[PDB]
Amino acid sequence: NCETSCVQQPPCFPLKIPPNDPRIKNQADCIPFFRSCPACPGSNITIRNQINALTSFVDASMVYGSEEPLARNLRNMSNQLGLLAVNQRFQDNGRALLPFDNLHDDPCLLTNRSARIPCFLAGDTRSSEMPELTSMHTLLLREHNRLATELKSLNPRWDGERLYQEARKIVGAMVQIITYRDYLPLVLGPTAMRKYLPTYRSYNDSVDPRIANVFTNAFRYGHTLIQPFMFRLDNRYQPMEPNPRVPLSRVFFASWRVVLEGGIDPILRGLMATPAKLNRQNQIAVDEIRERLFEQVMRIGLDLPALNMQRSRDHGLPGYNAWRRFCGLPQPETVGQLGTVLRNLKLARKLMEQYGTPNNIDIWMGGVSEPLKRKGRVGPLLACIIGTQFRKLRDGDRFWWENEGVFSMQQRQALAQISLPRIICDNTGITTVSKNNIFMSNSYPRDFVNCSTLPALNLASWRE
Amino acid sequence: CPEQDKYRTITGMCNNRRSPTLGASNRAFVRWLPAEYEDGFSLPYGWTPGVKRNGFPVALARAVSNEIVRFPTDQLTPDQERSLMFMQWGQLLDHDLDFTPEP
Numbered sequence: 111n112c113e114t115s116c117v118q119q120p121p122c123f124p125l126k127i128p129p130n131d132p133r134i135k136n137q138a139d140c141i142p143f144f145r146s147c148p149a150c151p152g153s154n155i156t157i158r159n160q161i162n163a164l165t166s167f168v169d170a171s172m173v174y175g176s177e178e179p180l181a182r183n184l185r186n187m188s189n190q191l192g193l194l195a196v197n198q199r200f201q202d203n204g205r206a207l208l209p210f211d212n213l214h215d216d217p218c219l220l221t222n223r224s225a226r227i228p229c230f231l232a233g234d235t236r237s238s239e240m241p242e243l244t245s246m247h248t249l250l251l252r253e254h255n256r257l258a259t260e261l262k263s264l265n266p267r268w269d270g271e272r273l274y275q276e277a278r279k280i281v282g283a284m285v286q287i288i289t290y291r292d293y294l295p296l297v298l299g300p301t302a303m304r305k306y307l308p309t310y311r312s313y314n315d316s317v318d319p320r321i322a323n324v325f326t327n328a329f330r331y332g333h334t335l336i337q338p339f340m341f342r343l344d345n346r347y348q349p350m351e352p353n354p355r356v357p358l359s360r361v362f363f364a365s366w367r368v369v370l371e372g373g374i375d376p377i378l379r380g381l382m383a384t385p386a387k388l389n390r391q392n393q394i395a396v397d398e399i400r401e402r403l404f405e406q407v408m409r410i411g412l413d414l415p416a417l418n419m420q421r422s423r424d425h426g427l428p429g430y431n432a433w434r435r436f437c438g439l440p441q442p443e444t445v446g447q448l449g450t451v452l453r454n455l456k457l458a459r460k461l462m463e464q465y466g467t468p469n470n471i472d473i474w475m476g477g478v479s480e481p482l483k484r485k486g487r488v489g490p491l492l493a494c495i496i497g498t499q500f501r502k503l504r505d506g507d508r509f510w511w512e513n514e515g516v517f518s519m520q521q522r523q524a525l526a527q528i529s530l531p532r533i534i535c536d537n538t539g540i541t542t543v544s545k546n547n548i549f550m551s552n553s554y555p556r557d558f559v560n561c562s563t564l565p566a567l568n569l570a571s572w573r574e
Numbered sequence: 575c576p577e578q579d580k581y582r583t584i585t586g587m588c589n590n591r592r593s594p595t596l597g598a599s600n601r602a603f604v605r606w607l608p609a610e611y612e613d614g615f616s617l618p619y620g621w622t623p624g625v626k627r628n629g630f631p632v633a634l635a636r637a638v639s640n641e642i643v644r645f646p647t648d649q650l651t652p653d654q655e656r657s658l659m660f661m662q663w664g665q666l667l668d669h670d671l672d673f674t675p676e677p
């Protein structure tokens with residue numbers, strides 16, 4: 111058992127502890143680790159690969175599910191209104207909350223014994239990992255029910271399955287719009303955005319839409335943006351006291367914080383009005399994830415950056431230089447060469463001291479070390495892997511919102527008016543939201559606007 | 575595989591009509607480069623004591639994290655042009671794309 115033993119026997123791949131560790135003084139101890147499930151168990155012929163349990167498409171699968179039995183269970187099958195199921199024991203000031211899960215071993219119950227609040231049930235199983243993620247799942251659950259109610263008044267003849275499918279299609283389009291219009295330009299920056307994501311022409315059935323193994327590790331760049339606290343703000347965007355800033359080690363799996371500590375509204379306010387952690391070559395990732403990851407529910411606090419590196423090795427990913435070659439980028443052979451690539455010799459030196467050669471630098475580590483691109487939050491290598499992946503998901507998606515036949519000219523014209531701040535107005539008691547782009551706006555009240563100013567999604571073109 | 579359809583399947587199956595499992599759930603990831611394992615096909619680098627990778631010892635992930643990643647929390651630089659919503663949307667989006675199951 112990988113949870114309690116330090117023996118390296120399949121499927122355990124524990125992380126050994128180095129001498130003079132700042133936290134783990136016992137070198138006979140380890141950081142637990144289970145190797146990812148192989149696609150072909152026990153094979154002496156196949157080169158080990160891992161499994162994607164989700165639909166690679168940007169289709170709101172974290173709301174609806176990627177398997178038919180789960181997808182059915184997430185729906186309100188009590189009526190013909192095409193809604194998703196909601197929590198029966200609790201509400202957030204009359205608003206809906208995700209349903210509870212039926213886990214045998216529930217980690218959310220360990221975060222506060224007294225509260226007895228289990229994990230939430232959503233399209234994806236990680237819905238309760240941090241209450242900020244739970245808030246986003248809850249926001250999208252309310253948007254589906256809101257859309258199916260609006261569509262039922264417009265088309266009374268429509269049944270439950272039609273209403274569910276039509277509301278699902280709109281939610282998925284909104285995820286695609288916010289991602290490609292607002293999110294990705296701010297991740298890649300403008301030159302990489304033009305290089306890897308040129309203007310959409312049409313669906314091409316020869317574009318492989320699968321997630322590449324490397325992308326599961328490269329996209330973990332987001333770990334460098336994580337703040338050490340969960341910030342909660344009241345009605346006037348002032349700290350929600352007591353406990354306006356709770357350390358991340360105290361919020362992992364803490365679903366009770368959503369049910370008993372004020373709902374999703376103060377969490378969403380905090381996400382909008384608090385700046386992200388800036389990735390700097392000498393300030394890569396915080397110790398709430400580097401030392402106290404899931405500290406409350408495990409026998410030892412995990413190290414997220416280290417888990418990423420052990421994961422790339424488990425996944426048999428090539429190192430830094432092989433990915434720099436794949437992207438058509440120069441491949442440094444020495445600390446001298448690498449210093450030039452990183453525009454920072456002191457980091458190149460530290461990297462060479464650990465790895466010996468830039469060929470061996472773990473893809474997450476090399477990727478998050480590169481200097482950020484102008485108006486972007488990743489360097490050239492991560493911009494390539496991320497950029498390449500998201501083009502495959504857009505050009506290889508037959509149900510891409512802009513593809514002819516998915517939506518009508520008028521429905522596309524209507525969908526272009528959506529935004530994440532508007533989705534928050536429609537589904538929360540928050541009356542003052544971020545001025546677009548929501549991902550750039552971060553200071554109250556300079557970057558904030560009233561909910562009345564933003565226009566709603568007009569469903570007129572959805573009538574029969 | 576239906577010749578005409580209005581909505582996505584829950585599993586993603588039948589999005590690509592020539593290869594109807596591409597992008598579907600519970601399928602192996604595509605690889606953009608051949609895998610690199612200590613034995614060529616399954617054992618990860620770091621599995622066997624003393625087995626070097628490309629002529630160099632394999633560094634412990636915890637040691638790399640300690641020397642390169644670790645930094646004093648009080649030094650944190652807030653991003654003047656990004657909100658925590660930028661971080662949170664990325665995690666939510668990542669949970670629409672991939673989940674690698676464990677034993």
Ligand SMILES: *[C@@H]1O[C@H](CO[C@@H]2O[C@@H](C)[C@@H](O)[C@@H](O)[C@@H]2O)[C@@H](O[C@@H]2O[C@H](CO)[C@@H](O[C@@H]3O[C@H](CO[C@H]4O[C@H](CO)[C@@H](O)[C@H](O)[C@@H]4O)[C@@H](O)[C@H](O[C@H]4O[C@H](CO)[C@@H](O)[C@H](O)[C@@H]4O)[C@@H]3O)[C@H](O)[C@H]2NC(C)=O)[C@H](O)[C@H]1NC(C)=O
Nearest residue numbers: 306311313314315316317318498500501502503504505506
């Ligand atoms: C529909 O999308 C198809 C996929 O396109 C890729 O993905 C999208 C999302 C974009 O990023 C796009 O930039 C990508 O190309 C697309 O089909 C592709 O079209 C290109 C160009 O015709 C094909 O490239 C050619 O490949 C042959 C074969 O060798 C390739 O495969 C081997 C093995 O993996 C590699 O070792 C090679 O390096 C190649 O990658 C080459 O012989 C050929 O190069 C030679 O010829 C050209 C001139 O014809 C010269 O410029 C070169 O110097 C060489 O002399 C090309 O590199 C690509 O294989 C093909 N992919 C698939 C999956 O079919 C398609 O065109 C898009 N359709 C529309 C209508 O837009």
Ligand code: HEC
Nearest residue numbers: 240326329330332333417418421661664665668672673674
């Ligand atoms: C925008 C990027 C991004 C953000 C932000 C992010 N992650 Fe990650 N994380 C990922 C991706 C992608 C993976 C790989 C997912 C997979 O396929 O299993 C991952 C994997 C993980 C894993 C599995 C580690 C392992 O290798 O065993 C943990 C734990 C994790 N993240 C926790 C979190 C937590 C906790 C947060 C913050 C609340 C977070 N992540 C935020 C993208 C991100």
Ligand SMILES: *[C@@H]1O[C@H](CO)[C@@H](O)[C@H](O)[C@H]1NC(C)=O
Nearest residue numbers: 186188189193194195196197
């Ligand atoms: C189903 O819908 C009705 C009407 O909106 C609601 O009262 C009921 O709680 C819902 N049930 C579930 C499980 O969501």
Ligand SMILES: *[C@@H]1O[C@H](CO)[C@@H](O)[C@H](O)[C@H]1NC(C)=O
Nearest residue numbers: 221222223224225226366370
């Ligand atoms: C647990 O939840 C209760 C509310 O039921 C709260 O009063 C208490 O402070 C919480 N305990 C911890 C350890 O957070």
Ligand SMILES: [Ca+2]
Nearest residue numbers: 165167171670
């Ligand atoms: Ca998906």
Ligand SMILES: [Cl-]
Nearest residue numbers: 197198209210
């Ligand atoms: Cl319930």
Ligand SMILES: [Cl-]
Nearest residue numbers: 323324605606
């Ligand atoms: Cl790959």
